[PDB]
Write a protein that binds this DNA or RNA. Structure first.
Ligand SMILES: Nc1ncnc2c1ncn2[C@@H]1O[C@H](CSCC[C@H](N)C(=O)O)[C@@H](O)[C@H]1O
Ligand SMILES: [Zn+2]
Ligand SMILES: [Zn+2]
Ligand SMILES: [Zn+2]
Ligand SMILES: [Zn+2]
Ligand SMILES: [Zn+2]
Ligand SMILES: [Zn+2]
Ligand SMILES: [Zn+2]
Lengths: 78, 103, 96, 311, 95, 124, 113, 80, 93, 105
DNA sequence: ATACAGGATGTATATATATCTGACACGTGCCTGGAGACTAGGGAGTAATCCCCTTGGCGGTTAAAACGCGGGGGACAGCGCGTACGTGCGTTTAAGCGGTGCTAGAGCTGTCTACGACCAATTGAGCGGCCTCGGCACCGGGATTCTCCAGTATGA
DNA sequence: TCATACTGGAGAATCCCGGTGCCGAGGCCGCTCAATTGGTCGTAGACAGCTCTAGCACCGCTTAAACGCACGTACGCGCTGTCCCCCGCGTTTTAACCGCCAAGGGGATTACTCCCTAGTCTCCAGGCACGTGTCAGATATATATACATCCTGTAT
């Protein structure tokens, strides 16, 4: 579930961000922020899909949801 | 055709049809599609030139998305334009802060 | 035995050179399905959409961690703290 | 000794050297030549204060007109000025014909504030304003208490200095010298030195006991009399300021009988009240009935005040 | 089948014109197509905003020139304006 | 019992005889005679300017005026008490001069010059 | 020569002026400016600066007072928001006084270049 | 010329008091002036472009409102 | 010349929710600008959805989805209920 | 009921919204139910804003609404603050907020 | 002889209060954008069909995940300090209100047209499907280059 | 005579070269449908002209705020010391991914009808500016109030 983001995963994400030393109370905050972001983008995608009268979420819906949030993403035919 | 009449490579007819079906205005001028195609061609030519330079800098023949990310992030005007734009399989610039460096 | 901090910089260089996905697929997909279950049950997703969501989340987390590192260096410290992430999200305007 | 309520201004080898040494109205007191400070005509006088008020110029003596035709924050700013600007001098009024009070003013020269008697500007920064207190204002915080001066009955319009005068017991406890409200005293043979003075009723700490009245004499007369008084081993001299000295031997008050005790029950203040330097005696501690009054003469040499032997 | 549109042929032609011995992958081609579409929709939106601000229902080359000057930085916008003016000249020479 | 004594007269104080008297009252008695004999000493003070001063001085000594605001009430008391004697000695106009002076010194309001000469002459 | 005089002179002294401690006036002004809504930047200097800046792009230009007022309001709001973010950053640094590096970090996190 | 110095020290002081700043250093005025100049240059460039596109010679308030909306700084109180 | 505004309707709403309450002209201009901004946002969202769905018609469903996407949960739910009630009242007569 | 708004029980003009959508160049054709829905949503939004403004004015013992009341009503709410995040109000001001660390002991 | 608490005292300050006015609320006329009524026709809802794109299950194996030791560099508490900022006051200097003249530019209107929309034919530039290969991915091996430990010359 | 700095040297993760294999891309062939051409009719927009209006230089006077200077102070930085918590490594566990095989149902596509709205002609009152009355609040004065701050009394 939410614990699928293991400690070494967040460790590698921090190494990618340039973090040298990490405390033991950062994982919960990172998990919360990721959950909030995923909930927002999933709500947007689900709304676009429900307006399309379909039952499957494609990639164009995710691209539109990211573009609407000012996070336009390339590489999927947007 | 019309692209040969202007010495360009981008299709003018496709752009004119997209402007008609784009619902941007009621009527579309004749010189607008040529101007838009020329601007887009210059932009993509700049991007491809920077990508080719980065690929020759990395001793490669085919451009990978990493080269595009490096060429966009190394430039100033392209970075200012594509500020809120992310590239898949792009990566980050090799930046390391000075305080984290040892003695 | 290496001294602390060398492996960190080595891993930084290694992960900045490569571009693969640090987060694996199945757990992220299960998390996405659990989050989407609350809005509507009995939903199906394409692999391309899950991959795009993973790419967007990784890019957003990388940018947030870079901003947090900038804030921690500006704070005349080296170790990052949750208050650094909170200040970064407050200054970016993503928090009320 | 004559009784006095106010001060009085007046203008073998030992004998050899003593001989060698020999070779109109007072606004400040509201009387005529005090001892503390050194129809035609009718109409001519009335015009000097009425300025063509015929209605009164005549009632006080047409006719008048005929004869006329014929003849024809801030307070704080002053505190700063005091800071910017133990010898003490006597105050004297200042008069500036065509200038305000400046460094050349006699007041600031003598390092003293301007008083209501000064003819200087109303807002003269050197004029000492009263206190804005709400009570007795006997604490250091009161500008009138910090500056030993007593509150003025015409400036300190809050603490009560301007209140009724019959009931000498008034709110502001910084006007005793003005009224002269001193406790009843009794003269009896002192258990310390000859005669002495005891207080009839009890009193509390820092309570105004009484004023030490005495003649005001020049500084040279101070030493001239003190020589013979020391020869007598008895002296009542008390330096008032660089200008004058107090001598109550010839005339003074009962309090004059006060003695000295290095551990006394009363202490003296050289207080500036209404521009007059006056000596007051206050209760250094709670005093009960019958106790004798003492205070530190502050002598530098114990020529005769070393007997002690008093509990 | 669905006859979808793209920009692969023109991008490849431009690449071969500026670099004959240089290849490209399909992912980079999709990225270039998305970038072209984004720039196109931004410029179209700017032109529409200018037409609506001026209470005019016509989009001429002047609106596009002002939009590309507003959206791009100084040197890039100057180069794009020069390219657009050259293209307009070449198009107005013939018919 | 401690025995106390009078300051003027060193006779002892009897337990019934005390009759409480500060003997250090607001104004001493010798001073009043001193002031009377000192005013007369003034050369160049026309007979009238000698009596009214004595009367005024005695009046303020008697009541002990301290403040300026008292001087209106003070000039009123001086007629309530000494006005009869002022009329007996024909010092009315010198008393008017006095009132003018007192007003010049900023002690009394101008309405009290008239109100005073009025009260004095109203009992004439 | 000198007489055996008894004297107890107390020099005394005047009271010091009322002086506030540093930081009180700052909080008072903070409350006063957070209550009111008037423009902290005056009109004439800001207008002259705007005219000088617009002179570089094109000379001989005219402006309406409403446009200048709108520009002033927008600039004041932007500066207030930036100063608030800078104060937050300075507070995070376990300090009170703001420094130019705080403004640099605020503009860096906002993504402004 | 020199109109950049029109932003006096007490003006920036009041702006900081409004923002909640308690203590201010002596090296903030240059940075504030630079940031304000950058912001003014951006919005003025946008407004001048909109005015040149309108084929007019006077800059109105609608142009400034549009320029602020384009920069993500939508401002209310002037119509549009 | 002539020009449009929204003063009458805003004043009517204010008097319906607060009879004894006034308003100044600056607040009226602010409300007008806010109404125009919300209107243009919803219209732009509807046009984007219409172009994404390859449909050249803007019905009430597109507006409903746009208001669901633009506003937070409770506010969007209240707006959707109000819009459905208004559509019902309009289709009744 | 001649006015469609009366037919729907609203106060906002439906005709003006329909004309703005036709001349707005937002799409090719315009539906019939869209203007009523949009007018109802806008009316609900402005009613919420006016309710908060009236509450703030009653909280300040005043009869006329000032822009300060609008600023307070917008900043005191959570959903409205999230919606109008990048929106500035002239003569609005900031909320009287003071941090805890600056307070003395 | 210390340290904390309490009174009081000068300073900034919400609140009564009588006035003046200009922005706010309301009456009035008229026009044009909204409402009525009837029609064509093309976009949209729905029935039917295909399939490919998605979902579900099982075997293995191996890189990734998980747990514990220890440790040394990092986080954090506390004192010195001296300098840069806060607060206040004299000086003045530039900001602000009251009108002053006026003209170049914003805005509305009559007029013509040349550029743009609509439509019939068409054909060639653009798109779906195939196919071979070489630039790139993976792996083994050796040289390369850094990375840490210890000793020796030099300061004080 | 001890602490410190700088140089030498033994030593492990990493770079480069050569070889082998592979699947996505550039060329190719068949296909087809939307851009191109010639032509006509219509009107949004450019142009010139006139009217008005507010942006700007101008001065003059008044005045609160800007400027500079004195004096005081408290905290940002530096330094010290003291505790401790993630990092490097080793050992044990484990499930992600890969490859393969079934299976189905919702998305894409095609054909049918149908109904609602863009359009056009006609007519009217809701809302627009314009004008006018009017009291809520700005303005100014004074008073009660809240409070930061400093000296003094008290307990250990
Ligand atoms: N306690 C004492 N012992 C000896 N002499 C004293 C004294 N107290 C005061 N004196 C002398 O008395 C003089 C002051 S007069 C004091 C009162 C006087 N002794 C009397 O009995 O009435 C001084 O000059 C001092 O020298
Ligand atoms: Zn006298
Ligand atoms: Zn003088
Ligand atoms: Zn004097
Ligand atoms: Zn004086
Ligand atoms: Zn006092
Ligand atoms: Zn006093
Ligand atoms: Zn007093």
């Amino acid at each position: 579930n939410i614990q699928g983001i293991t400690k070494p995963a967040i460790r590698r994400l921090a190494r990618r961000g340039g973090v040298k030393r990490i405390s033991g109370l950062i994982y919960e905050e990172t998990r919360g922020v990721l959950k909030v972001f995923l909930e927002n983008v999933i709500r947007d995608a689900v709304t676009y899909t429900e307006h399309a009268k379909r039952k499957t979420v494609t990639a164009m819906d995710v691209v539109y949801a990211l573009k609407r949030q000012g996070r336009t993403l390339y590489g999927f035919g947007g | 055709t019309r692209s040969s009449r202007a010495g360009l490579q981008f299709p003018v007819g496709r752009v004119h049809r997209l402007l008609r079906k784009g619902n941007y205005a009621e009527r579309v001028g004749a010189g607008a599609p040529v101007y838009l195609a020329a601007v887009l061609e210059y932009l993509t030519a700049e991007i491809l030139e920077l990508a080719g330079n980065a690929a020759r800098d990395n001793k490669k023949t085919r451009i990978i998305p990493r080269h595009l990310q490096l060429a966009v992030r190394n430039d100033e005007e392209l970075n200012k334009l594509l500020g809120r734009v992310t590239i898949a399989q792009g990566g980050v610039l090799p930046n390391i802060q000075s305080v984290l460096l040892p003695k | 035995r290496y001294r602390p901090g060398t492996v960190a910089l080595r891993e930084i260089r290694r992960y900045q050179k490569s571009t693969e996905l640090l987060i694996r697929k199945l757990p992220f997909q299960r998390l996405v399905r659990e989050i989407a279950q609350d809005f509507k049950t009995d939903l199906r997703f394409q692999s391309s959409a899950v991959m795009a969501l993973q790419e967007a989340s990784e890019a957003y987390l990388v940018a947030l961690f870079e901003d947090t590192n900038l804030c921690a260096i500006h704070a005349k410290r080296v170790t990052i703290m949750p208050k650094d992430i909170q200040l970064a999200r407050r200054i970016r305007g993503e928090r009320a | 000794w004559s009784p006095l309520q106010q001060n009085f201004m007046v203008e073998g080898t030992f004998i050899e050297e003593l001989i060698k040494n020999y070779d109109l109205f007072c606004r400040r007191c509201f009387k005529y030549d005090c001892f503390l400070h050194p129809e035609a005509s009718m109409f001519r006088v009335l015009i000097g204060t009425y300025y063509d008020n015929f209605c009164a110029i005549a009632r006080l003596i047409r006719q008048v007109y005929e004869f006329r035709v014929k003849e024809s924050x801030x307070x704080x700013x002053x505190x700063x000025x005091x800071x910017x600007x133990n010898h003490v001098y006597n105050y004297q009024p200042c008069d500036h014909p065509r200038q305000p009070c400046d460094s050349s003013c006699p007041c600031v020269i003598a390092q003293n504030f301007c008083e209501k008697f000064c003819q200087c500007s109303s807002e003269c920064q050197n004029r000492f304003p009263g206190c804005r207190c709400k009570a007795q204002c006997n604490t250091k915080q009161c500008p009138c208490y910090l500056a030993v001066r007593e509150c003025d009955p015409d400036l300190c319009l809050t603490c009560g200095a301007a209140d009724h005068w019959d009931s000498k017991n008034v709110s502001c406890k910084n006007c005793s010298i003005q009224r002269g409200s001193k406790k009843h005293l009794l003269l009896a043979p002192s258990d310390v030195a000859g005669w002495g003075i005891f207080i009839k009723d009890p009193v509390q700490k820092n309570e105004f006991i009484s004023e030490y009245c005495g003649e005001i004499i020049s500084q040279d007369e101070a030493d001239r009399r003190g020589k013979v008084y020391d020869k007598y081993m008895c002296s009542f001299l008390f330096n008032l300021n660089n200008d004058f000295v107090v001598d109550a031997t010839r005339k003074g008050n009962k309090i004059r009988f006060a003695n000295h005790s290095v551990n006394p029950n009363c202490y003296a203040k050289v207080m500036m009240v209404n521009g007059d330097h006056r000596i007051g005696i206050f209760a250094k501690r709670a005093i009960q009935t019958g106790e004798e009054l003492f205070f530190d003469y502050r002598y530098s040499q114990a020529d005769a005040l070393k007997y002690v032997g008093i509990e | 089948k669905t006859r979808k549109e793209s920009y692969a042929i023109y991008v490849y032609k431009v690449l071969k014109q500026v670099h004959p011995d240089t290849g490209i992958s399909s992912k980079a081609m999709s990225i270039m197509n998305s970038f072209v579409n984004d720039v196109f929709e931004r410029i179209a939106g700017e032109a529409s905003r200018l037409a609506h601000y001026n209470k005019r229902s016509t989009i001429t080359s002047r609106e596009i020139q002002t939009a590309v000057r507003l959206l791009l930085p100084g040197e890039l916008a100057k180069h794009a304006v020069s390219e657009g003016t050259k293209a307009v000249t070449k198009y107005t020479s013939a018919k | 019992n401690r025995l106390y004594f009078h300051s003027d007269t060193c006779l002892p104080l009897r337990p019934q005889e005390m009759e409480v008297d500060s003997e250090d009252e607001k104004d001493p008695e010798w001073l009043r005679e001193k002031t009377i004999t000192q005013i007369e000493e003034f050369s160049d003070v026309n007979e009238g300017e000698k009596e009214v001063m004595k009367l005024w001085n005695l009046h303020v000594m008697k009541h002990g005026f301290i403040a300026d605001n008292q001087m209106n009430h003070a000039c009123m008391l001086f007629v309530e008490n000494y006005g009869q004697k002022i009329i007996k000695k024909n010092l009315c106009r010198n008393f008017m001069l006095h009132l003018v002076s007192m007003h010049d010194f900023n002690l009394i309001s101008i309405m009290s010059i008239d109100k005073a000469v009025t009260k004095l002459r109203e009992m004439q």
